[PDB]
Protein backbone atom coordinates (compact mmCIF):
# COMPACT_ATOMS: atom_id res chain seq x y z
CA UNK A 1 0.00 0.00 0.00
CA UNK A 2 1.24 3.50 -1.07
CA UNK A 3 0.83 5.01 2.43
CA UNK A 4 2.76 2.22 4.17
CA UNK A 5 6.09 4.01 3.85
CA UNK A 6 4.77 6.84 6.06
CA UNK A 7 4.41 4.56 9.07
CA UNK A 8 8.08 4.74 10.10
CA UNK A 9 8.04 8.45 10.85
CA UNK A 10 4.42 8.85 12.03
CA UNK A 11 3.36 5.80 14.06
CA UNK A 12 4.48 3.01 16.36
CA UNK A 13 2.77 -0.37 16.57
CA UNK A 14 0.46 -0.98 19.53
CA UNK A 15 -0.18 -4.60 18.55
CA UNK A 16 -3.54 -3.97 16.90
CA UNK A 17 -4.46 -3.06 13.33
CA UNK A 18 -5.76 0.51 13.07
CA UNK A 19 -4.57 1.50 16.56
CA UNK A 20 -1.19 3.26 16.63
CA UNK A 21 0.98 5.41 18.84
CA UNK A 22 1.55 8.86 17.34
CA UNK A 23 5.06 10.37 17.08
CA UNK A 24 5.78 14.00 17.94
CA UNK A 25 6.13 14.83 14.23
CA UNK A 26 2.69 13.46 13.50
CA UNK A 27 1.01 15.15 16.47
CA UNK A 28 2.62 18.50 15.65
CA UNK A 29 0.80 18.51 12.32
CA UNK A 30 -2.48 17.26 13.82
CA UNK A 31 -2.30 20.21 16.24
CA UNK A 32 -1.55 22.76 13.48
CA UNK A 33 -4.43 21.41 11.40
CA UNK A 34 -6.77 21.74 14.41
CA UNK A 35 -5.62 25.35 14.94
CA UNK A 36 -6.21 26.07 11.24
CA UNK A 37 -9.73 24.67 11.40
CA UNK A 38 -10.38 26.72 14.54
CA UNK A 39 -9.25 29.86 12.68
CA UNK A 40 -12.16 29.30 10.25
CA UNK A 41 -14.86 28.83 12.92
CA UNK A 42 -17.91 30.95 12.17
CA UNK A 43 -19.32 33.65 14.46
CA UNK A 44 -21.55 32.62 17.37
CA UNK A 45 -20.20 29.05 17.67
CA UNK A 46 -20.13 27.27 21.03
CA UNK A 47 -17.16 24.89 21.54
CA UNK A 48 -17.58 21.61 23.41
CA UNK A 49 -15.09 18.78 23.85
CA UNK A 50 -16.37 15.23 24.40
CA UNK A 51 -14.59 12.23 25.93
CA UNK A 52 -14.06 9.04 23.88
CA UNK A 53 -17.12 7.42 25.48
CA UNK A 54 -20.78 8.33 25.53
CA UNK A 55 -24.01 7.12 27.06
CA UNK A 56 -25.26 3.84 25.57
CA UNK A 57 -28.84 5.02 26.13
CA UNK A 58 -28.19 8.20 24.12
CA UNK A 59 -26.68 6.28 21.26
CA UNK A 60 -29.57 3.77 21.22
CA UNK A 61 -31.98 6.69 21.12
CA UNK A 62 -29.98 8.28 18.26
CA UNK A 63 -30.81 5.38 15.96
CA UNK A 64 -27.24 4.17 15.61
CA UNK A 65 -28.32 0.50 15.86
CA UNK A 66 -30.66 0.93 12.89
CA UNK A 67 -27.78 2.19 10.77
CA UNK A 68 -24.34 0.92 11.82
CA UNK A 69 -24.62 -1.83 14.49
CA UNK A 70 -21.60 -3.65 13.08
CA UNK A 71 -19.33 -0.60 13.71
CA UNK A 72 -20.14 0.05 17.36
CA UNK A 73 -17.74 -0.52 20.26
CA UNK A 74 -19.51 -1.08 23.59
CA UNK A 75 -17.80 -0.75 26.94
CA UNK A 76 -18.03 -3.91 29.03
CA UNK A 77 -16.58 -4.73 32.43
CA UNK A 78 -16.39 -7.28 35.22
CA UNK A 79 -19.36 -6.22 37.35
CA UNK A 80 -19.70 -9.11 39.81
CA UNK A 81 -18.75 -9.62 43.45
CA UNK A 82 -15.19 -10.18 44.68
CA UNK A 83 -15.64 -13.95 44.32
CA UNK A 84 -17.19 -13.76 40.86
CA UNK A 85 -14.46 -11.40 39.64
CA UNK A 86 -11.77 -13.59 41.21
CA UNK A 87 -13.25 -16.62 39.44
CA UNK A 88 -13.02 -14.86 36.06
CA UNK A 89 -9.41 -13.90 36.78
CA UNK A 90 -8.65 -17.48 37.92
CA UNK A 91 -9.92 -18.84 34.59
CA UNK A 92 -7.48 -16.52 32.79
CA UNK A 93 -4.62 -17.83 34.92
CA UNK A 94 -5.82 -21.37 34.17
CA UNK A 95 -5.67 -20.82 30.42
CA UNK A 96 -9.43 -20.48 30.06
CA UNK A 97 -11.46 -17.42 29.04
CA UNK A 98 -12.08 -14.65 31.59
CA UNK A 99 -14.11 -12.56 29.11
CA UNK A 100 -17.23 -14.75 29.42
CA UNK A 101 -17.86 -12.85 32.65
CA UNK A 102 -17.99 -9.46 30.89
CA UNK A 103 -21.22 -7.50 31.07
CA UNK A 104 -22.18 -4.27 29.25
CA UNK A 105 -21.74 -0.91 30.90
CA UNK A 106 -24.00 2.04 30.26
CA UNK A 107 -21.28 3.41 27.93
CA UNK A 108 -20.15 2.99 24.32
CA UNK A 109 -17.13 4.35 22.50
CA UNK A 110 -18.30 7.44 20.62
CA UNK A 111 -18.81 6.68 16.89
CA UNK A 112 -18.94 10.34 15.85
CA UNK A 113 -18.38 13.64 17.58
CA UNK A 114 -21.83 15.19 17.14
CA UNK A 115 -24.15 12.73 18.95
CA UNK A 116 -23.83 14.17 22.47
CA UNK A 117 -24.58 17.66 21.24
CA UNK A 118 -28.25 17.05 20.35
CA UNK A 119 -29.57 16.28 23.83
CA UNK A 120 -27.51 19.20 25.14
CA UNK A 121 -29.16 21.52 22.62
CA UNK A 122 -32.62 20.08 23.38
CA UNK A 123 -32.19 20.73 27.11
CA UNK A 124 -32.16 24.51 26.54
CA UNK A 125 -35.66 24.74 25.12
CA UNK A 126 -36.67 26.21 21.76
CA UNK A 127 -33.85 27.44 19.52
CA UNK A 128 -33.25 31.16 19.08
CA UNK A 129 -33.84 32.72 15.67
CA UNK A 130 -30.89 31.78 13.47
CA UNK A 131 -30.42 28.52 15.36
CA UNK A 132 -27.40 27.23 17.31
CA UNK A 133 -23.90 26.45 16.07
CA UNK A 134 -21.46 24.13 17.80
CA UNK A 135 -17.81 23.21 17.47
CA UNK A 136 -17.33 19.68 18.77
CA UNK A 137 -14.45 17.22 18.86
CA UNK A 138 -13.98 13.69 20.14
CA UNK A 139 -11.79 10.63 19.75
CA UNK A 140 -14.09 8.33 17.84
CA UNK A 141 -14.16 4.58 17.37
CA UNK A 142 -15.19 2.43 14.43
CA UNK A 143 -14.95 -1.36 14.66
CA UNK A 144 -13.23 -1.94 11.34
CA UNK A 145 -9.70 -3.34 11.68
CA UNK A 146 -7.50 -2.60 8.68
CA UNK A 147 -3.80 -2.30 7.95
CA UNK A 148 -4.26 0.83 5.81
CA UNK A 149 -3.05 4.07 7.43
CA UNK A 150 -6.19 5.93 6.29
CA UNK A 151 -8.55 3.41 7.89
CA UNK A 152 -8.16 3.47 11.68
CA UNK A 153 -10.31 2.06 14.44
CA UNK A 154 -9.55 4.97 16.76
CA UNK A 155 -9.35 8.44 15.22
CA UNK A 156 -9.96 12.13 16.00
CA UNK A 157 -13.03 13.90 14.61
CA UNK A 158 -13.71 17.63 14.55
CA UNK A 159 -17.13 18.93 13.53
CA UNK A 160 -19.04 22.14 13.16
CA UNK A 161 -22.72 21.49 13.72
CA UNK A 162 -25.73 23.64 12.85
CA UNK A 163 -29.14 23.18 14.46
CA UNK A 164 -31.99 25.38 13.22
CA UNK A 165 -34.55 25.80 10.43
CA UNK A 166 -34.06 24.13 7.03
CA UNK A 167 -32.90 27.52 5.71
CA UNK A 168 -30.43 27.94 8.60
CA UNK A 169 -28.84 24.56 7.88
CA UNK A 170 -28.82 24.90 4.10
CA UNK A 171 -27.07 28.31 4.44
CA UNK A 172 -24.54 26.69 6.81
CA UNK A 173 -24.15 23.80 4.36
CA UNK A 174 -23.37 26.06 1.37
CA UNK A 175 -20.86 27.99 3.47
CA UNK A 176 -18.98 24.93 4.73
CA UNK A 177 -18.83 23.18 1.37
CA UNK A 178 -16.98 26.29 0.16
CA UNK A 179 -14.86 26.72 3.28
CA UNK A 180 -13.82 23.06 3.46
CA UNK A 181 -12.57 23.22 -0.14
CA UNK A 182 -10.75 26.50 0.56
CA UNK A 183 -9.03 24.88 3.54
CA UNK A 184 -7.94 21.84 1.48
CA UNK A 185 -6.66 24.17 -1.25
CA UNK A 186 -4.69 26.25 1.29
CA UNK A 187 -3.17 23.01 2.61
CA UNK A 188 -1.95 22.21 -0.92
CA UNK A 189 -4.09 19.09 -1.19
CA UNK A 190 -5.61 17.64 -4.38
CA UNK A 191 -9.24 16.65 -4.09
CA UNK A 192 -12.64 16.31 -5.65
CA UNK A 193 -16.03 16.65 -4.06
CA UNK A 194 -18.85 14.24 -4.66
CA UNK A 195 -22.06 13.09 -3.14
CA UNK A 196 -21.75 9.85 -1.28
CA UNK A 197 -23.39 7.74 1.37
CA UNK A 198 -22.68 6.42 4.86
CA UNK A 199 -21.94 2.69 5.20
CA UNK A 200 -25.41 1.68 6.42
CA UNK A 201 -25.63 -1.99 7.45
CA UNK A 202 -27.53 -4.82 5.77
CA UNK A 203 -30.26 -4.84 3.16
CA UNK A 204 -32.20 -2.00 4.77
CA UNK A 205 -28.85 -0.21 4.64
CA UNK A 206 -28.82 -0.47 0.84
CA UNK A 207 -32.08 1.48 0.65
CA UNK A 208 -30.84 4.04 3.17
CA UNK A 209 -27.62 4.56 1.20
CA UNK A 210 -29.55 4.93 -2.07
CA UNK A 211 -31.89 7.52 -0.59
CA UNK A 212 -29.00 9.46 0.94
CA UNK A 213 -27.06 9.49 -2.33
CA UNK A 214 -30.18 10.38 -4.36
CA UNK A 215 -31.14 13.17 -1.96
CA UNK A 216 -27.55 14.45 -1.86
CA UNK A 217 -27.52 14.45 1.93
CA UNK A 218 -23.83 13.60 2.12
CA UNK A 219 -21.00 15.50 0.42
CA UNK A 220 -17.39 14.20 0.73
CA UNK A 221 -14.08 15.78 -0.07
CA UNK A 222 -11.98 12.98 -1.52
CA UNK A 223 -8.20 12.92 -1.64
CA UNK A 224 -6.24 10.42 -3.73
CA UNK A 225 -3.98 8.70 -1.20
CA UNK A 226 -3.48 5.12 -2.38
CA UNK A 227 -4.94 5.75 -5.84
CA UNK A 228 -6.92 8.25 -7.89
CA UNK A 229 -9.65 5.67 -8.53
CA UNK A 230 -10.06 4.92 -4.84
CA UNK A 231 -9.64 8.29 -3.10
CA UNK A 232 -10.09 8.82 0.65
CA UNK A 233 -12.85 10.95 2.21
CA UNK A 234 -11.13 13.41 4.55
CA UNK A 235 -13.97 15.88 5.09
CA UNK A 236 -17.74 15.46 4.80
CA UNK A 237 -20.91 17.49 4.99
CA UNK A 238 -23.90 15.67 6.34
CA UNK A 239 -27.44 17.01 6.14
CA UNK A 240 -29.68 15.09 8.56
CA UNK A 241 -32.93 16.92 7.76
CA UNK A 242 -35.20 16.71 10.82
CA UNK A 243 -33.92 13.30 12.00
CA UNK A 244 -32.11 14.43 15.16
CA UNK A 245 -34.48 17.34 15.75
CA UNK A 246 -37.37 14.89 15.96
CA UNK A 247 -35.44 12.29 17.94
CA UNK A 248 -34.45 14.74 20.65
CA UNK A 249 -37.47 17.03 20.62
CA UNK A 250 -35.54 20.05 19.39
CA UNK A 251 -37.89 22.88 18.31
CA UNK A 252 -36.74 25.68 16.00
CA UNK A 253 -37.82 29.32 16.51
CA UNK A 254 -41.05 28.65 14.53
CA UNK A 255 -42.01 25.70 16.72
CA UNK A 256 -41.11 23.08 14.08
CA UNK A 257 -38.83 20.05 14.57
CA UNK A 258 -35.30 21.40 13.97
CA UNK A 259 -33.08 20.43 11.08
CA UNK A 260 -29.41 19.70 11.70
CA UNK A 261 -26.31 19.43 9.56
CA UNK A 262 -22.60 19.07 10.19
CA UNK A 263 -19.25 19.46 8.47
CA UNK A 264 -16.81 16.82 9.69
CA UNK A 265 -13.00 16.90 9.48
CA UNK A 266 -11.18 13.57 9.86
CA UNK A 267 -8.12 14.86 11.66
CA UNK A 268 -6.02 11.71 11.26
CA UNK A 269 -6.95 11.29 7.60
CA UNK A 270 -6.04 14.95 6.96
CA UNK A 271 -2.71 14.53 8.78
CA UNK A 272 -1.91 11.38 6.78
CA UNK A 273 -2.95 13.23 3.59
CA UNK A 274 -0.57 16.08 4.41
CA UNK A 275 2.36 13.74 4.98
CA UNK A 276 1.53 11.72 1.85
CA UNK A 277 1.34 14.95 -0.18
CA UNK A 278 4.19 16.96 1.28
CA UNK A 279 6.48 14.33 2.78
CA UNK A 280 7.85 13.87 6.29
CA UNK A 281 10.40 16.72 6.15
CA UNK A 282 8.54 19.84 7.30
CA UNK A 283 11.37 22.18 6.26
CA UNK A 284 10.69 21.22 2.62
CA UNK A 285 6.92 21.81 2.74
CA UNK A 286 5.67 24.50 0.33
CA UNK A 287 6.23 27.99 1.71
CA UNK A 288 2.56 28.93 1.41
CA UNK A 289 1.52 25.79 3.31
CA UNK A 290 4.06 26.39 6.05
CA UNK A 291 2.73 29.97 6.33
CA UNK A 292 -0.92 28.84 6.42
CA UNK A 293 -0.05 26.39 9.21
CA UNK A 294 2.10 28.84 11.16
CA UNK A 295 5.31 26.81 10.84
Amino acid sequence: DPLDHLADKLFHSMGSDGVYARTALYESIVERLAALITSHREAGTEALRFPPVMSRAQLEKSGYLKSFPNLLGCVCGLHGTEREINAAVSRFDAGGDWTTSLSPADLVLSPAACYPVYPIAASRGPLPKGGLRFDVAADCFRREPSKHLDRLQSFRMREYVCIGTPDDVSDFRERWMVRAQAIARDLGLTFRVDYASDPFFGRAGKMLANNQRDQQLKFELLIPLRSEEQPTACMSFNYHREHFGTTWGIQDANGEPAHTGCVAFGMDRLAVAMFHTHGTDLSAWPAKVRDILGL
Binding site: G63, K66, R203, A204, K206, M207, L208, N210, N211, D214, Q215, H243
Partner: protein
Protein backbone atom coordinates in the same frame (compact mmCIF):
# COMPACT_ATOMS: atom_id res chain seq x y z
CA UNK B 1 -52.46 -7.33 -2.89
CA UNK B 2 -53.78 -3.92 -1.84
CA UNK B 3 -55.23 -5.42 1.34
CA UNK B 4 -51.84 -7.02 2.00
CA UNK B 5 -50.11 -3.63 1.86
CA UNK B 6 -52.62 -1.73 4.02
CA UNK B 7 -51.90 -4.08 6.93
CA UNK B 8 -48.14 -3.66 6.46
CA UNK B 9 -48.36 0.14 6.17
CA UNK B 10 -50.41 0.09 9.39
CA UNK B 11 -47.88 -2.25 11.00
CA UNK B 12 -44.57 -0.60 10.04
CA UNK B 13 -45.49 2.74 8.45
CA UNK B 14 -46.05 4.44 11.81
CA UNK B 15 -48.05 7.34 10.34
CA UNK B 16 -50.13 9.60 12.66
CA UNK B 17 -53.40 8.70 10.86
CA UNK B 18 -54.92 5.21 10.19
CA UNK B 19 -54.06 3.36 6.95
CA UNK B 20 -57.77 3.31 6.05
CA UNK B 21 -57.53 7.08 5.49
CA UNK B 22 -54.76 7.11 2.86
CA UNK B 23 -56.06 7.16 -0.72
CA UNK B 24 -53.56 5.03 -2.70
CA UNK B 25 -52.45 8.08 -4.74
CA UNK B 26 -51.38 10.42 -1.93
CA UNK B 27 -47.68 10.86 -1.15
CA UNK B 28 -46.86 8.61 1.82
CA UNK B 29 -44.03 10.91 2.95
CA UNK B 30 -46.31 13.94 3.14
CA UNK B 31 -48.64 11.54 4.95
CA UNK B 32 -45.96 11.09 7.63
CA UNK B 33 -43.78 8.19 6.47
CA UNK B 34 -40.18 8.63 7.62
CA UNK B 35 -37.02 7.11 6.15
CA UNK B 36 -36.48 4.45 8.78
CA UNK B 37 -40.18 3.60 8.73
CA UNK B 38 -39.96 3.30 4.94
CA UNK B 39 -37.13 0.75 5.15
CA UNK B 40 -39.20 -1.27 7.63
CA UNK B 41 -42.00 -0.98 5.09
CA UNK B 42 -39.69 -2.23 2.34
CA UNK B 43 -38.66 -5.19 4.51
CA UNK B 44 -42.34 -5.96 5.14
CA UNK B 45 -43.18 -5.98 1.43
CA UNK B 46 -40.36 -8.50 0.97
CA UNK B 47 -41.66 -10.65 3.83
CA UNK B 48 -45.41 -10.67 3.12
CA UNK B 49 -44.43 -11.77 -0.38
CA UNK B 50 -41.37 -13.77 -1.47
CA UNK B 51 -39.46 -11.12 -3.39
CA UNK B 52 -36.28 -9.05 -3.01
CA UNK B 53 -36.13 -5.59 -4.63
CA UNK B 54 -33.29 -4.91 -7.03
CA UNK B 55 -31.21 -2.04 -5.60
CA UNK B 56 -32.29 -0.15 -8.73
CA UNK B 57 -35.87 0.14 -7.44
CA UNK B 58 -34.71 0.23 -3.83
CA UNK B 59 -35.43 3.89 -3.19
CA UNK B 60 -37.70 6.74 -2.11
CA UNK B 61 -39.67 6.66 -5.38
CA UNK B 62 -40.93 3.07 -5.08
CA UNK B 63 -42.57 3.83 -1.73
CA UNK B 64 -44.02 7.28 -2.47
CA UNK B 65 -47.64 6.10 -2.54
CA UNK B 66 -49.72 2.93 -2.16
CA UNK B 67 -50.17 2.70 -5.95
CA UNK B 68 -46.42 3.17 -6.33
CA UNK B 69 -45.79 0.10 -4.17
CA UNK B 70 -48.38 -2.14 -5.85
CA UNK B 71 -47.06 -1.41 -9.35
CA UNK B 72 -43.49 -2.14 -8.27
CA UNK B 73 -44.32 -5.60 -6.90
CA UNK B 74 -45.87 -6.95 -10.11
CA UNK B 75 -42.72 -5.91 -11.97
Amino acid sequence: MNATIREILAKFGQLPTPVDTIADEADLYAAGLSSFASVQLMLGIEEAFDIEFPDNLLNRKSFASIKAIEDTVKL
